[PDB]
mmCIF file of C-alpha atoms in Angstrom:
data_model
loop_
_atom_site.group_PDB
_atom_site.id
_atom_site.type_symbol
_atom_site.label_atom_id
_atom_site.label_comp_id
_atom_site.label_asym_id
_atom_site.label_seq_id
_atom_site.Cartn_x
_atom_site.Cartn_y
_atom_site.Cartn_z
ATOM 1 C CA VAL U 1 28.260 10.403 -10.047
ATOM 2 C CA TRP U 2 29.560 10.046 -6.450
ATOM 3 C CA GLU U 3 26.842 10.377 -3.749
ATOM 4 C CA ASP U 4 26.512 9.522 -0.014
ATOM 5 C CA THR U 5 22.674 9.728 0.321
ATOM 6 C CA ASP U 6 21.322 6.127 0.609
ATOM 7 C CA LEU U 7 17.769 7.426 1.197
ATOM 8 C CA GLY U 8 15.379 7.600 -1.792
ATOM 9 C CA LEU U 9 12.426 9.916 -2.493
ATOM 10 C CA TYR U 10 9.907 7.576 -0.687
ATOM 11 C CA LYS U 11 10.430 5.267 2.373
ATOM 12 C CA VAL U 12 9.823 1.452 2.770
ATOM 13 C CA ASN U 13 6.217 0.357 3.672
ATOM 14 C CA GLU U 14 4.916 3.651 2.206
ATOM 15 C CA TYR U 15 1.651 3.952 0.277
ATOM 16 C CA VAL U 16 2.522 5.362 -3.196
ATOM 17 C CA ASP U 17 0.690 5.891 -6.556
ATOM 18 C CA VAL U 18 2.494 4.506 -9.680
ATOM 19 C CA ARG U 19 1.720 5.916 -13.187
ATOM 20 C CA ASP U 20 1.171 3.559 -16.175
ATOM 21 C CA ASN U 21 3.287 3.555 -19.424
ATOM 22 C CA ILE U 22 0.937 2.922 -22.426
ATOM 23 C CA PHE U 23 -1.968 5.256 -21.322
ATOM 24 C CA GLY U 24 -0.363 7.126 -18.343
ATOM 25 C CA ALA U 25 -3.101 6.160 -15.835
ATOM 26 C CA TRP U 26 -2.320 6.333 -12.055
ATOM 27 C CA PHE U 27 -2.680 2.897 -10.374
ATOM 28 C CA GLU U 28 -2.103 2.776 -6.589
ATOM 29 C CA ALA U 29 0.627 0.648 -5.009
ATOM 30 C CA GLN U 30 2.387 -0.199 -1.706
ATOM 31 C CA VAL U 31 6.233 -0.199 -1.547
ATOM 32 C CA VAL U 32 7.820 -2.917 0.671
ATOM 33 C CA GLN U 33 11.495 -2.313 -0.296
ATOM 34 C CA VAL U 34 13.317 0.796 -1.673
ATOM 35 C CA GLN U 35 16.615 0.681 -3.645
ATOM 36 C CA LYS U 36 18.448 3.987 -4.372
ATOM 37 C CA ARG U 37 21.211 4.446 -7.060
ATOM 38 C CA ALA U 38 24.631 2.971 -5.975
ATOM 39 C CA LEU U 39 26.277 5.172 -3.298
ATOM 40 C CA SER U 40 30.023 5.802 -2.969
ATOM 41 C CA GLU U 41 32.183 3.434 -0.859
ATOM 42 C CA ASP U 42 33.882 6.553 0.675
ATOM 43 C CA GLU U 43 35.594 8.758 -2.001
ATOM 44 C CA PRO U 44 36.739 12.526 -1.598
ATOM 45 C CA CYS U 45 33.849 13.198 0.870
ATOM 46 C CA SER U 46 33.529 15.027 4.229
ATOM 47 C CA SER U 47 29.898 16.326 4.574
ATOM 48 C CA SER U 48 26.748 17.617 2.713
ATOM 49 C CA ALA U 49 24.877 14.929 0.667
ATOM 50 C CA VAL U 50 21.899 15.630 -1.706
ATOM 51 C CA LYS U 51 18.872 13.611 -3.049
ATOM 52 C CA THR U 52 19.288 11.836 -6.428
ATOM 53 C CA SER U 53 17.117 12.606 -9.515
ATOM 54 C CA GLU U 54 13.997 10.516 -10.300
ATOM 55 C CA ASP U 55 15.716 8.136 -12.802
ATOM 56 C CA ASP U 56 17.819 5.778 -10.663
ATOM 57 C CA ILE U 57 15.638 4.743 -7.626
ATOM 58 C CA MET U 58 13.734 1.385 -7.824
ATOM 59 C CA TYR U 59 10.628 0.905 -5.596
ATOM 60 C CA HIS U 60 9.408 -2.679 -5.039
ATOM 61 C CA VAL U 61 5.631 -1.934 -5.180
ATOM 62 C CA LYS U 62 2.473 -4.151 -5.103
ATOM 63 C CA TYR U 63 -0.184 -2.926 -7.580
ATOM 64 C CA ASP U 64 -3.882 -2.710 -6.473
ATOM 65 C CA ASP U 65 -4.994 -5.185 -9.223
ATOM 66 C CA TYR U 66 -1.693 -7.227 -9.091
ATOM 67 C CA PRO U 67 -0.964 -8.227 -5.321
ATOM 68 C CA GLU U 68 -0.853 -11.848 -6.647
ATOM 69 C CA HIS U 69 2.241 -10.897 -8.721
ATOM 70 C CA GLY U 70 4.027 -9.952 -5.435
ATOM 71 C CA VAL U 71 5.972 -6.702 -6.041
ATOM 72 C CA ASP U 72 7.561 -5.069 -9.141
ATOM 73 C CA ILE U 73 10.428 -2.520 -9.273
ATOM 74 C CA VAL U 74 9.626 0.980 -10.630
ATOM 75 C CA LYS U 75 11.975 3.920 -11.424
ATOM 76 C CA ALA U 76 11.226 6.986 -9.207
ATOM 77 C CA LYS U 77 9.797 8.980 -12.208
ATOM 78 C CA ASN U 78 7.028 6.320 -12.557
ATOM 79 C CA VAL U 79 5.950 6.708 -8.874
ATOM 80 C CA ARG U 80 4.780 9.611 -6.615
ATOM 81 C CA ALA U 81 3.802 9.477 -2.884
ATOM 82 C CA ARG U 82 0.110 8.584 -2.340
ATOM 83 C CA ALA U 83 -2.059 11.607 -1.615
ATOM 84 C CA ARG U 84 -3.049 11.851 2.090
ATOM 85 C CA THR U 85 -3.304 15.642 2.579
ATOM 86 C CA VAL U 86 -6.162 16.996 0.393
ATOM 87 C CA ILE U 87 -5.719 20.751 -0.245
ATOM 88 C CA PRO U 88 -9.238 22.435 -0.473
ATOM 89 C CA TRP U 89 -10.383 25.908 -1.726
ATOM 90 C CA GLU U 90 -9.296 27.389 1.675
ATOM 91 C CA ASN U 91 -5.604 26.477 1.059
ATOM 92 C CA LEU U 92 -5.799 26.370 -2.805
ATOM 93 C CA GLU U 93 -2.650 27.771 -4.544
ATOM 94 C CA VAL U 94 -2.112 28.222 -8.329
ATOM 95 C CA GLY U 95 0.598 25.885 -9.694
ATOM 96 C CA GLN U 96 0.044 22.906 -7.305
ATOM 97 C CA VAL U 97 -0.112 19.469 -9.078
ATOM 98 C CA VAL U 98 -3.094 17.285 -8.042
ATOM 99 C CA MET U 99 -4.744 14.058 -9.338
ATOM 100 C CA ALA U 100 -8.447 13.908 -10.306
ATOM 101 C CA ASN U 101 -10.854 11.122 -11.431
ATOM 102 C CA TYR U 102 -11.461 11.433 -15.220
ATOM 103 C CA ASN U 103 -13.379 8.731 -17.112
ATOM 104 C CA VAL U 104 -12.406 9.276 -20.774
ATOM 105 C CA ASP U 105 -12.894 5.545 -21.574
ATOM 106 C CA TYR U 106 -16.573 5.185 -20.429
ATOM 107 C CA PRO U 107 -18.373 8.299 -18.836
ATOM 108 C CA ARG U 108 -20.842 5.808 -17.129
ATOM 109 C CA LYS U 109 -18.162 4.206 -14.848
ATOM 110 C CA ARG U 110 -15.135 5.367 -12.740
ATOM 111 C CA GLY U 111 -12.211 5.647 -15.200
ATOM 112 C CA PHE U 112 -8.659 6.563 -14.105
ATOM 113 C CA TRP U 113 -6.921 9.210 -11.975
ATOM 114 C CA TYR U 114 -4.731 11.569 -14.076
ATOM 115 C CA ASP U 115 -2.385 14.333 -12.843
ATOM 116 C CA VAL U 116 -3.342 17.977 -13.546
ATOM 117 C CA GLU U 117 -1.712 21.386 -12.851
ATOM 118 C CA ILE U 118 -4.165 23.782 -11.104
ATOM 119 C CA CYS U 119 -4.210 26.948 -13.276
ATOM 120 C CA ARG U 120 -7.205 29.044 -12.028
ATOM 121 C CA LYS U 121 -9.472 29.314 -8.961
ATOM 122 C CA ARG U 122 -12.829 31.171 -8.893
ATOM 123 C CA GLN U 123 -14.591 31.068 -5.493
ATOM 124 C CA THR U 124 -17.621 33.358 -4.931
ATOM 125 C CA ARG U 125 -20.818 32.804 -2.823
ATOM 126 C CA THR U 126 -22.740 32.218 -6.113
ATOM 127 C CA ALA U 127 -20.192 30.021 -8.076
ATOM 128 C CA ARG U 128 -17.058 27.809 -7.454
ATOM 129 C CA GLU U 129 -15.135 26.955 -10.679
ATOM 130 C CA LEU U 130 -11.658 25.369 -10.565
ATOM 131 C CA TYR U 131 -9.572 25.246 -13.774
ATOM 132 C CA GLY U 132 -6.470 23.181 -14.566
ATOM 133 C CA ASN U 133 -4.243 21.839 -17.354
ATOM 134 C CA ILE U 134 -5.550 18.266 -17.927
ATOM 135 C CA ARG U 135 -2.983 15.816 -19.377
ATOM 136 C CA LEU U 136 -4.709 13.808 -22.183
ATOM 137 C CA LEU U 137 -3.528 10.313 -23.230
ATOM 138 C CA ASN U 138 -3.323 11.173 -27.004
ATOM 139 C CA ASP U 139 -0.371 13.614 -26.272
ATOM 140 C CA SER U 140 -2.493 16.750 -25.601
ATOM 141 C CA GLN U 141 -2.868 19.271 -22.698
ATOM 142 C CA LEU U 142 -6.352 20.874 -22.276
ATOM 143 C CA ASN U 143 -5.511 24.046 -20.296
ATOM 144 C CA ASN U 144 -8.154 25.756 -18.054
ATOM 145 C CA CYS U 145 -10.468 22.676 -18.144
ATOM 146 C CA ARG U 146 -13.295 22.211 -15.573
ATOM 147 C CA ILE U 147 -11.971 20.302 -12.531
ATOM 148 C CA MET U 148 -14.476 17.572 -11.488
ATOM 149 C CA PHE U 149 -14.813 18.034 -7.657
ATOM 150 C CA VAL U 150 -12.571 18.324 -4.516
ATOM 151 C CA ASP U 151 -13.543 14.751 -3.345
ATOM 152 C CA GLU U 152 -12.368 13.402 -6.769
ATOM 153 C CA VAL U 153 -9.227 15.597 -6.343
ATOM 154 C CA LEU U 154 -6.284 14.453 -4.175
ATOM 155 C CA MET U 155 -3.103 16.603 -3.752
ATOM 156 C CA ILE U 156 0.003 14.715 -5.005
ATOM 157 C CA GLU U 157 2.704 14.685 -2.281
ATOM 158 C CA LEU U 158 6.312 15.920 -2.986
ATOM 159 C CA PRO U 159 9.261 13.360 -3.482
ATOM 160 C CA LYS U 160 12.188 15.791 -2.752
ATOM 161 C CA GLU U 161 11.190 15.962 0.967
ATOM 162 C CA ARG U 162 12.088 12.203 1.260
ATOM 163 C CA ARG U 163 8.635 11.102 2.452
ATOM 164 C CA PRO U 164 8.257 8.779 5.545
ATOM 165 C CA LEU U 165 4.473 8.123 5.054
ATOM 166 C CA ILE U 166 4.353 4.632 6.622
ATOM 167 C CA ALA U 167 1.418 2.193 6.654
ATOM 168 C CA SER U 168 0.253 0.770 10.044
ATOM 169 C CA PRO U 169 2.407 -2.104 11.659
ATOM 170 C CA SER U 170 1.582 -5.325 9.623
ATOM 171 C CA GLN U 171 -1.429 -3.404 8.123
ATOM 172 C CA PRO U 172 -1.057 -1.827 4.567
ATOM 173 C CA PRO U 173 -3.991 0.622 3.584
ATOM 174 C CA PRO U 174 -7.140 -1.512 2.651
ATOM 175 C CA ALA U 175 -8.845 1.717 1.445
ATOM 176 C CA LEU U 176 -8.272 2.204 -2.347
ATOM 177 C CA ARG U 177 -9.753 3.981 -5.449
ATOM 178 C CA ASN U 178 -12.161 2.357 -7.945
ATOM 179 C CA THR U 179 -9.728 1.479 -10.773
ATOM 180 C CA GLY U 180 -9.910 -1.127 -13.571
ATOM 181 C CA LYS U 181 -11.374 -2.186 -16.910
ATOM 182 C CA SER U 182 -13.839 -5.067 -17.485
ATOM 183 C CA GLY U 183 -15.828 -5.729 -20.690
ATOM 184 C CA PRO U 184 -19.616 -6.615 -20.827
#
C-alpha cells in the first residue's frame, strides 16, 4: 500500500522490550536503527499520512543477554516501548496492559516478565487486591489472577503515539531487569 509516513512506532536510540517466540517471555533491548515499511516515491499524494501496522517495521535492537551479537532486526509486533511511566493504584484504569514478573519456571528465582490485561481493582484501607488476565505459555489465559505487586508491575507504553523515548547521549540505560536461565 502507498504511504508517506517514514516514522515507525518507536524512535532510534530508544529503550524497548522485545517479546520472545518459543515461550513468549519479554527480554529488554535497545534499538540503534529503525526501518519502516517502504514509503512511496511520490504517487497520487497531497497531505495526511498515517502510521503503518505492526507487521512491516524492523527495529535493530541489542538484547540484554546478547550485546555481543551486536543488534538483530525485529518486526514491530515483537517489540513494545520499554516501560518508564509506572501507573499505580491512584491512576489505575481497567483495561490497561502492563507487564509483571512471573516465575513459572522456578518459584525460587526471578523468572520472566509477561504481559497482562488489568481486569479488576479492589482498594480499601484493609485490603488491596489487583486482578488481571495472565497470558500463560501453554496457550492459556488465567483471567482475574492475583497480580504480584506494583514494583514488579511496569505499564507497557503505546506504539501508535510514535514514541521518542531516547537514551542519554552516548549512554544507553545500564539499569535492567533480572532475566535469564542457568542450570545448577
